[PDB]
Design a protein around this ligand. Structure first.
Ligand code: CLA
Ligand code: CLA
Ligand code: CLA
Ligand code: CLA
Ligand code: CLA
Ligand code: CLA
Ligand code: CLA
Ligand code: CLA
Ligand SMILES: CC1=C(/C=C/C(C)=C/C=C/C(C)=C/C=C/C=C(C)/C=C/C=C(C)/C=C/C2=C(C)CCCC2(C)C)C(C)(C)CCC1
Ligand SMILES: CC1=C(C/C=C(\C)CCC[C@H](C)CCC[C@H](C)CCCC(C)C)C(=O)c2ccccc2C1=O
Ligand SMILES: CC1=C(C/C=C(\C)CCC[C@H](C)CCC[C@H](C)CCCC(C)C)C(=O)c2ccccc2C1=O
Ligand code: SF4
Lengths: 29, 161, 108, 30, 37, 706, 80, 139, 107
């Protein structure tokens, strides 16, 4: 691969990370 | 010849099992004294081997590529002695022991102390049930037809629903 | 029967101390030989655990015939030290040495 | 190079963080 | 002693001693009975 | 009085360590929470399915990324006959120098893991060729998992909460899942094969940018509307055509040749194109159609047991059909993956089938109502439940008396120097069925060995075109299509039939007897999971419906253990060309022991010797690691609780009287594990140790030889 | 605490009371007859849940039941 | 009442008794009059000697009090055991005999707590009591 | 311990079929059975079988021949005892067969 594609994939993985944190904080409520 | 199985009289793998079984006993015999007592027990073992290969060759068995006699249960009457004939021979004997112990328990239960007669077995009532047990394929036919072979479900105890 | 909680619990600890420090030294030696680290395990060509309290008792009983049991011609056994007694072509008895492995199993 | 940073982060550091918030969330009380 | 032999362990054993020895003596005169010939 | 767990407030008053363990166990049991309503219940189920759906998407993106980043996918496309697929790169600080030289495998410079899932084989036939194409799939599945985790939180908001009547309306549910989810998404996958996967198998690069330009057919969609659908069945890929190039390829897109590809030993993609097309047409027309229905709709545990039964059947359906009919290019040649793929789904199918009866058993305690449910099919199966168990008590005991004695016969007889006296029953019934399907090796000569039969001829409309392709595969002994079986295959299938009958016997025991027996008539008043009713009435240990699940998990592991030992050893002679090892040695139980467990675990167990180490030393470690965790479950299984409660009551003493540690105090009073708790703890260590041990053995005994 | 419920098929046998190791149970006069008795559990917070009161009840499928509820320090039987 | 202070038996021992649970909340004490100077087993370890007394013993659990209170009724026939549970760092005084008589003896004025006016086969299904605060055995 | 002792020295207890050491090979596997059979008694509990037998007394009471000595499951204390008895018998007799078939061949 290219080295810039790895940090792009880590960047777009923050979008499920906040949403999994947002869902679990609503599922707990 | 039902599944590519050549008969054992012309199966060369089966006829080669005999060549190696006796060669593993003749070399076991080759060291011993010829008149000795372990010498004659190997010839009794060599000839007991020859009485099972000639018993399996003439019986018309089916040997595969390994050379061992395979059995064919779909029951064909040309291969009836494998499972169908000793199976019928089984079923009478097992039903004899079955109907004897069932006829014993119905006789014992309508007595004074039924649990006592299960520990110490009444040789009158035990040999009576053997006499009632030899006739079991006939005896169960009029037993099932009379209505007293089984019980209705209002008479048995049953878990709550 | 009045200090049985002191007997059992001190017996409880000494199994856990021995279970870690004997079986875990095999688990360490599994993991070291699996990871390609044979110089970090407990062995005879590695971190040695020689049984010195048992190797000494092998010395006081193999050199005891003639010094402290003076009438005896040979030792109480050839297992501690002595010649190889060879009856037929096979060993009848020879000195059972003790090493790093023998430290581990005797603590198992 | 990114393996050498990430695997002791979630192998050591990130379990030690989530063990801390859980152990406080367990033993707290209303 | 006859009322002792009617008990379950002995009569469970001697008939099993009988039924085994039935099967043992069969395989001595009739060895290696695979099928019905 | 603490807060955790929020689910059970009666667990929060528990001041022991049981509160910690039972908070983890009563966690996702949403019917047990305090203050829950059924309207609030189904919405928590719906959002949790969104959380689970994202995990499947995040997991697949991880498999796509680590092959794109740390794999050798481009190196493997050019030569799948020599290149081993790489799972991910290894970065462990605990390695040595001689170990990095031993795990730098498949010609790589870094420690890598040789993959045994075969997603290389799956993505190679979906069309992918380059490492950048896999990364775009991993990027896309991070968007779908973001779509899943957003929609789960969205459907808990008060304006977007689905109504309760939307949940319990199953009439519109089946129209849409068969229609949309099963039909259109098989019609959509039909679009992937003809546009992308078929031209990528013929040397043409079809990606997202150029697929609107190029057409799948030289006469695209002009005869779809006039009805001339037969022009899609033109010159296909011949026997000359190697996979993935224009070397003698074809232009057909929906063909029904049957059989396999002559070089990859896999299905033709034109077959799979025409397959999911017709699956789509059947599922579309099946979705235009919509006191027991009041029971299945009300009961959440009813539909869950039926789903795990439906999943558990079709999961075995995958594993039985994937090895004989390889759907993926070069998956038949990868022996380790093919072995790991059968054993994967069969162990899951056992867990799904056990959990099917488990959740039906929970339905009978919680949701079943015998005053409302009367005289239907359900309240009649309960009415003669003693007749079902006892007749399952027979066929368990009928097979196990005999197929064990058939083994002990063949053991004793072979041990006495006389192998010529074994009871070898040829499986003529199944050998008929292969001869019914066309295998002319045996010579039964009816039904598709009969060349003049009405099925092979099809005298109605001259149909039989797929039979030239099928009959060149089953008759040829180069693949695993309808394997040649002998009398050793007889004895295992009746061990298997013993296992499926016995596991059903335990599972339907506690299912039907979940509501009461003569021992405990009020077993519905105590729930699904509870230890016992004491030592009275003779003592009632393991009596509950939970502990009938718990005994059958040993039986499914043993049944799949019988199954996958037979799969592996049969194929270990098929792949090695020496079929005679399974022929003579499988009839008696020592050859099963000597020539499978002892002979094949030699190269595994030399993973690390005192002279070196190999790439199998991670498997030889995990082998022994699996033995140790399996044996630890015995500790919670054999030894029971009140030994340990009286062992902790002395460790509590020795902690309260030890100075400099008397000061440090627990907040939870330490107790032993509960009775139901360490049955689960002992079964978990048993089940993990069962599976970890075989997966280390099944991989390393096949990777050492292929 | 564990819940202890006494059903009306009891006969005043007094056997479950004297088999209780934590002194939960007691005997009480009956309303509709004023001669026979029944067991009663006024001290269910003391109940450890040993189910010894069910091992002593002579009726077929015993008149006194113990349902193991939430586990306090008494019902866990803890000396600490 | 508890009559503390009352003489502990001549014992001197027992690791197995009255640890840190007693000082924070809920220990127990059994009080009796022993009509000898004889030895008796404790639930902790075994001996003490019973006094002439007014004998008192501070125990950790109520289960250990009824086990000792059964031994004094069995072996020595002193059935005058009177257990208690303590004050501010305890909970409830005068646990037994709760109404001036032993619980196996009938006493009018007691009220049938935990009684059910039904059998156990007349218990409802849990599906009838689903999603409610009722339980399948309470009335 | 696995490779060089238990695997390497059980090569005489399994290659013993067809030779004079064959009853050590049969006692080897036959004691693996009794050992593993013991876990049926150790891992499980009584009250399963007492309601499994209730389905088998029914299928004998259906044909009117259930015994007057009522069938019970083995007790909790007996089920532990019959499980430890087959456990030791299964493992000692495996060690019996492994030791005998090894040292007769090499020693
Ligand atoms: C192989 C399976 C197995 C294992 C591992 C154990 C282990 C143990 N048993 Mg058990 N037991 C077993 C089978 C087993 N038993 C069976 C089948 C029965 C039924 C008969 C019992 C019945 C039984 C009784 C009756 C008793 C025990 C006791 C014990 C403990 C002894 C104390 C000790 O030395 O710990 C040492 C620990 C080990 C040897 C485990 C090795 C692990 C290594 C060294 C460390 C782990 C690595 C790493 C740090 C892991 C953490 C990392 C991770 C969290 C990420 C120990 C935990 C006794 C006890 O508890 O008294 C103290 C006791 O009285 N057991
Ligand atoms: C899964 C994650 C993980 C990772 C990435 C590591 C990594 C390591 N372990 Mg392993 N270990 C782990 C889990 C892990 N461990 C577990 C679960 C167990 C129980 C089975 C062990 C048991 C174990 C033992 C017994 C030992 C190791 C050792 C090591 C080190 C070997 C290489 C080395 O010596 O570098 C050289 C680098 C150093 C020697 C120093 C590293 C820097 C230190 C640890 C931190 C500095 C402090 C810093 C200011 C703040 C703390 C940060 C820290 C918490 C990350 C390496 C750091 C060896 C070691 O050296 O331990 C420290 C060692 O003896 N491990
Ligand atoms: C001397 C040693 C001895 C031995 C080895 C046995 C062995 C046995 N007895 Mg026992 N038993 C014995 C003495 C012995 N008994 C004596 C002296 C009596 C009093 C007469 C009994 C009274 C007895 C009864 C009532 C029963 C047994 C039964 C059994 C069998 C158990 C179940 C079975 O294996 O089938 C077993 C063979 C049971 C059985 O069914 O035997 C077949 C059984 O019901 N025994
Ligand atoms: C269990 C039932 C049983 C039955 C039906 C038989 C039946 C027989 N025995 Mg056998 N026998 C038995 C047990 C049995 N045996 C046992 C337990 C022993 C060991 C003590 C023997 C030792 C024995 C000898 C030494 C001989 C027989 C012989 C015979 C045969 C001749 C008839 C006879 O009774 O003498 C007959 C087939 C004889 C025979 O005919 O051999 C050729 C003979 O010589 N038996
Ligand atoms: C349960 C499965 C099973 C089945 C179907 C068989 C069937 C058979 N075995 Mg095998 N065998 C078994 C289990 C089984 N055995 C076990 C568990 C062992 C180890 C103990 C053996 C060890 C063994 C050996 C060493 C030999 C056999 C032989 C035989 C054949 C019997 C020959 C004969 O004379 O009987 C016919 C019997 C009669 C005509 C009499 C019937 C009436 C009896 C007395 C009723 C008894 C009821 C109690 C028959 C095919 C022999 C054989 O022929 O090899 C090919 C043989 O040499 N068996
Ligand atoms: C269900 C999913 C799906 C979707 C979204 C598409 C979409 C498309 N197809 Mg495809 N295709 C599909 C399934 C699908 N197809 C199936 C099931 C078949 C087999 C019958 C085909 C066989 C096919 C051919 C032969 C052609 C298309 C073509 C097209 C394109 C033009 C359609 C049009 O305007 O009329 C469009 C992108 C045409 C094209 O040129 O693609 C750019 C074209 O020639 N399709
Ligand atoms: C998609 C299908 C599905 C769904 C939605 C559910 C949902 C549920 N099940 Mg069901 N069940 C299922 C499949 C499913 N299950 C399967 C496949 C089985 C057979 C295995 C079961 C058997 C079963 C039983 C017996 C019970 C349930 C129960 C439940 C309920 C609560 C679960 C819980 O809170 O446990 C908490 C979760 C855990 C404690 C998880 C720990 C166990 C895992 C396996 C440990 C894994 C080991 C370790 C991590 C491996 C490490 C790797 C190693 C290399 C180190 C919940 C309704 C319970 C109930 O009461 O229903 C009302 C209940 O008693 N299930
Ligand atoms: C060598 C190991 C071994 C063997 C031979 C058996 C044999 C048997 N089991 Mg057992 N079982 C075992 C281990 C074993 N089990 C283990 C480890 C468990 C987990 C505790 C069980 C749990 C179990 C259950 C729950 C049941 C059986 C049943 C059976 C019987 C099945 C009928 C038949 O095959 O004939 C058979 C006697 C069944 C039975 O006896 O039905 C009548 C039955 O319901 N087994
Ligand atoms: C208890 C319970 C439960 C459970 C149940 C279950 C779990 C079951 C299972 C079961 C199962 C899971 C079943 C299965 C079935 C299957 C089948 C039965 C199949 C069939 C098949 C066939 C029919 C085929 C045939 C063929 C062939 C072979 C070829 C040719 C053609 C044809 C196709 C015809 C529930 C939940 C309800 C609830 C209540 C209770
Ligand atoms: C050892 C043992 C105990 C004692 C076990 C105790 C007290 C638990 C000790 C386990 C310690 C805490 C280590 C566990 C750590 C695990 C590796 C991870 C646990 C955390 C998970 C949530 C991930 C029992 O209480 C018991 C009860 C019933 C039958 C058998 C047994 C039994 O065998
Ligand atoms: C299998 C099993 C049973 C069932 C086993 C039973 C009921 C034993 C019955 C088997 C014997 C073999 C019945 C013997 C019947 C007669 C004595 C047979 C006489 C035959 C003569 C010819 C000798 C339990 O009761 C049990 C209880 C607690 C924990 C585990 C288990 C357990 O694992
Ligand atoms: S703890 Fe187990 S053995 Fe003891 S009474 Fe309860 S269920 Fe039976």
């Amino acid at each position: 691969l290219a080295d810039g594609q790895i940090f792009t994939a880590l960047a777009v993985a923050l979008v499920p990370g906040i949403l999994a944190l947002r869902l679990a904080l609503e599922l707990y409520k | 010849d039902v599944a590519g199985l050549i008969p054992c009289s012309q199966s060369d793998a089966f006829e080669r099992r005999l060549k190696n079984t006796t060669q593993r006993l003749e070399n076991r015999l080759k060291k011993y004294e010829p008149g000795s007592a372990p010498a004659e027990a190997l010839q009794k073992q060599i000839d007991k081997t020859q009485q099972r290969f000639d018993k399996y060759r003439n019986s018309g068995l089916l040997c595969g590529a390994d050379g061992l006699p395979h059995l064919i249960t779909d029951g064909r009457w040309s291969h009836a002695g494998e499972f169908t004939i000793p199976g019928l021979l089984f079923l009478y004997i097992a039903g004899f022991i079955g109907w004897s112990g069932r006829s014993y328990l119905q006789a014992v239960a309508a007595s004074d102390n039924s649990t006592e007669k299960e520990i110490i077995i009444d040789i009158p009532v035990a040999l009576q049930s053997v006499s009632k047990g030899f006739v079991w394929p006939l005896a169960a036919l009029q037993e099932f037809s009379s209505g007293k072979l089984t019980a209705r479900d209002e008479e048995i105890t049953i878990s709550p629903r | 029967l009045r200090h049985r909680d002191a007997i059992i619990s001190h017996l409880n600890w000494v199994c856990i101390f021995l279970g870690f420090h004997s079986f875990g030294l095999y688990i360490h030696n599994d993991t070291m030989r699996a990871l390609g680290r044979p110089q970090d395990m407990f062995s005879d060509a590695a971190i040695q655990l020689q049984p010195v309290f048992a190797q000494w008792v092998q010395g006081v009983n193999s050199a005891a015939a003639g010094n402290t049991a003076p009438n005896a011609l040979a030792n109480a056994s050839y297992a501690f030290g002595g010649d190889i007694v060879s009856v037929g072509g096979k060993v009848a008895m020879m000195p059972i040495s003790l090493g790093t492995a023998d430290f581990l199993v005797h603590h198992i | 190079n990114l393996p050498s940073i990430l695997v002791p982060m979630v192998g050591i550091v990130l379990p030690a963080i989530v063990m801390a918030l859980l152990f406080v969330y367990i033993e707290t009380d209303e | 002693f006859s009322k002792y032999l009617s008990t379950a362990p002995v009569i469970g054993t001697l008939t099993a001693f009988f039924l085994a020895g039935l099967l043992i003596e069969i395989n001595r005169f009739n060895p290696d009975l695979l099928v019905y010939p | 009085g603490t807060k955790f767990p929020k689910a059970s407030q009666a667990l929060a008053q528990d001041p022991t360590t049981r509160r910690i363990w039972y908070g983890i166990a009563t966690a996702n049991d949403f019917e047990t929470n305090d203050g829950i309503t059924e309207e609030n219940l189904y919405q928590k189920i719906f959002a949790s399915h969104f959380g689970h759906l994202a995990i499947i998407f995040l997991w697949t993106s991880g498999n796509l990324f680590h092959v794109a980043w740390q794999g050798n996918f481009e190196q493997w496309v050019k030569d799948p006959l020599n290149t081993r697929p790489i799972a991910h790169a290894i970065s462990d600080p605990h390695f040595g120098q001689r170990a990095i030289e031993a795990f730098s495998q498949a010609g790589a410079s870094s420690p890598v893991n040789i993959s045994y899932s075969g997603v290389y084989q799956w993505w190679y036939t979906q069309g992918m060729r380059t490492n950048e194409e896999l990364y775009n799939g991993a990027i896309f599945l991070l968007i779908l998992s973001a779509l899943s985790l957003f929609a789960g939180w969205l459907h808990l908001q008060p304006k977007f909460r689905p109504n309760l009547s939307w949940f319990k309306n199953a009439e519109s549910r089946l129209n849409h899942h068969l229609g949309g989810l099963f039909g259109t998404s098989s019609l959509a996958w039909t679009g992937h094969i003809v546009h992308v996967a078929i031209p990528e198998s013929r040397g043409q690069h079809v990606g997202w940018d150029n697929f609107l330009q190029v057409a799948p057919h030289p006469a695209g969609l002009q005869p779809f509307f006039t009805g001339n659908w037969g022009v899609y069945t033109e010159n296909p890929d011949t026997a000359n055509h190697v996979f993935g190039s224009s070397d003698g390829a074809g232009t057909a897109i929906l063909t029904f040749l049957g059989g396999f590809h002559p070089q990859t030993q896999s299905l033709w993609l034109t077959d799979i194109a025409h397959h999911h097309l017709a699956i789509a047409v059947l599922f579309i027309v099946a979705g235009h159609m919509y006191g027991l229905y009041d029971t299945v709709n009300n009961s959440l545990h009813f539909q869950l047991g039926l789903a795990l039964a439906a999943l558990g059947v079709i999961t075995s359906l995958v594993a039985q059909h994937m090895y004989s009919i390889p759907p993926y290019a070069y998956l038949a040649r990868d022996f380790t993956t093919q072995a790991a793929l059968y054993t994967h789904h069969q162990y899951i199918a056992g867990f799904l089938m056990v959990g099917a009866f488990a959740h039906g058993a929970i339905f009978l305690v919680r949701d079943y109502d015998a005053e409302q449910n009367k005289n239907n099919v359900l309240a009649r199966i309960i009415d003669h439940k003693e007749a079902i168990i006892s007749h399952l008590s027979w066929v368990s005991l009928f097979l196990g008396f005999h197929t064990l004695g058939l083994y002990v016969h063949n053991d004793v007889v072979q041990a006495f120097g006389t192998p010529e006296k074994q009871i070898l029953i040829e499986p003529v019934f199944a050998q008929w069925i292969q001869s019914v399907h066309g295998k002319s090796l045996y010579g039964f000569e009816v039904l598709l060995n009969n060349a003049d039969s009405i099925t092979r001829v099809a005298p109605g409309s001259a149909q039989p075109i797929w039979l030239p392709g099928w009959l060149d595969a089953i008759n040829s002994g180069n693949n695993s299509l309808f394997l040649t079986i002998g009398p050793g295959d007889f004895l295992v299938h009746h061990a298997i039939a013993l296992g499926l009958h016995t596991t059903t016997l335990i599972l339907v025991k506690g299912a039907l007897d979940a509501r009461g027996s003569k021992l405990m008539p009020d077993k519905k008043d105590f729930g699904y999971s509870f230890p016992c009713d004491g030592p009275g009435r003779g003592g009632t240990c393991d009596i509950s419906a939970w502990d009938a699940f718990y005994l059958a998990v040993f039986w499914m592991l043993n049944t799949i253990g019988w199954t996958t030992f037979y799969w592996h050893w049969k194929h270990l002679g098929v792949w090695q060309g020496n079929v005679a090892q399974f022929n003579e040695s499988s009839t008696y139980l020592m050859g099963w022991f000597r020539d499978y467990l002892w002979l094949n675990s030699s190269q595994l167990i030399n993973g690390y010797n005192p002279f070196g180490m190999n790439n199998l030393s991670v498997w030889a470690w995990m082998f022994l690691f699996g033995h140790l965790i399996w044996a630890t479950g015995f500790m919670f299984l054999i030894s029971w609780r009140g030994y340990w409660q009286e062992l902790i009551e002395t460790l509590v003493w020795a902690h309260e009287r030890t100075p400099l540690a008397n000061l440090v105090r627990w907040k939870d009073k330490p107790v032993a594990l509960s009775i139901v708790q360490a049955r689960l703890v002992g079964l978990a260590h048993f089940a993990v140790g069962y599976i970890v041990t075989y997966a280390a053995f099944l991989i390393a005994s096949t990777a050492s030889k292929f | 605490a564990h819940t202890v419920k006494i059903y009306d098929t009891c006969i005043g046998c007094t056997q479950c009371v004297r088999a209780c190791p934590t002194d939960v149970l007691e005997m009480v006069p009956w309303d509709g007859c004023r001669a026979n008795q029944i067991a009663s559990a006024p001290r269910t917070e003391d109940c450890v849940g040993c189910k010894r009161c069910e091992s002593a009840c002579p009726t077929d499928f015993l008149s006194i039941r113990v349902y193991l509820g939430a586990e306090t320090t008494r019902s866990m039987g803890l000396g600490y | 009442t508890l009559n503390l202070n009352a003489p502990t038996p001549i014992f001197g021992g027992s690791t197995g008794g009255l640890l840190r649970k007693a000082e924070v909340e809920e220990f127990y004490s059994i009080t009796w009059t022993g009509k000898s100077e004889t030895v008796f087993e404790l639930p902790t370890g075994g001996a003490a000697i019973m006094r002439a007394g007014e004998n008192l013993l501070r125990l950790a659990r109520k289960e250990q009090c009824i086990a000792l209170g059964a031994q004094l009724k069995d072996k020595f026939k002193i059935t005058d055991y009177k257990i208690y549970r303590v004050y501010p760092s305890g909970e409830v005084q005068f646990l037994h005999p709760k109404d001036g008589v032993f619980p196996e003896k009938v006493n009018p004025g007691r009220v049938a707590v935990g009684s059910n006016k039904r059998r156990i086969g007349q218990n409802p299904d849990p599906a009838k009591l689903k999603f409610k605060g009722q339980e399948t055995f309470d009335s | 311990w696995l490779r060089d002792f238990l695997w390497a020295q059980a090569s005489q207890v399994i290659q013993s079929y067809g030779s004079a050491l064959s009853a050590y090979g049969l006692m080897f596997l036959g004691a693996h059975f009794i050992w593993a059979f013991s876990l049926m008694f150790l891992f499980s509990g009584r009250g399963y079988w007492q309601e499994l037998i209730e389905s088998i007394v029914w299928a004998h009471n259906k044909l009117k021949f259930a015994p007057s000595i009522q069938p019970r499951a083995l007790s909790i204390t007996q089920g532990r005892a019959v499980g430890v008895a087959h456990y030791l018998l299964g493992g000692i007799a495996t060690t019996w067969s492994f030791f005998h078939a090894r040292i007769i061949s090499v020693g």
